[PDB]
């Protein structure tokens, strides 16, 4: 579980939105596996606008931040889970690195802020959904 708070928006992963959040709905993309509900306080997260390749995730199955190198935000096959059939996942990054399907919701960041939250896994393997392209989480 997880979520990035900035200014008053609740990111979270659609397949562990609660029922607040459809109902206070703001955008979902099944495609990303994002989902974005309105807040009535303000939150910290500051997003990141960039392009690295490098930074740190929360593994909640180990209570650790861990140093990684992903990918770039990619259009990539993601097998059948309790929440989606197999198919292809757009905007993920991959990196090698523990999770496990509680994991998802973890923030990855880097200097210049979060970057995206953990949204799948393998052996080995994590996976997370882009938000640097979301510009308006900073506005309205
Ligand atoms: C950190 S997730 C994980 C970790 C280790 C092993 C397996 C997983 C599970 C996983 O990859 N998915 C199941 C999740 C319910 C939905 C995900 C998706 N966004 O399509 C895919
Ligand atoms: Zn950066």
Redesign the pocket.
């Known amino acids: 579980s997880g979520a990035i708070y900035v200014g008053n928006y609740r990111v979270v ?1 659609r ?1 562990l939105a609660t029922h607040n959040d459809w109902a206070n709905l703001v955008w979902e993309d099944s495609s990303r ?1 994002l989902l974005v509900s309105s807040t009535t306080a303000q939150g910290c997260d500051t997003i990141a606008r960039c392009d690295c390749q490098t930074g740190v995730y929360y593994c909640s199955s180990r209570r650790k931040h861990y140093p990684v190198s992903f990918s770039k935000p990619s259009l990539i096959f ?2 059948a ?4 059939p197999a ?1 292809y ?1 757009s905007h993920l990054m991959l990196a090698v690195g523990h ?3 509680g ?2 919701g973890g923030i990855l960041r880097c200097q210049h802020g979060v970057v995206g939250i ?5 052996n080995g393997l ?2 997370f ?1 882009d938000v640097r392209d979301l510009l308006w989480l900073d506005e309205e």
């Open positions: 992963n397949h596996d993601v097998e889970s309790e929440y989606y198919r996942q999770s496990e399907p994991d998802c953990v949204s799948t896994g393998g994590v996976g959904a």
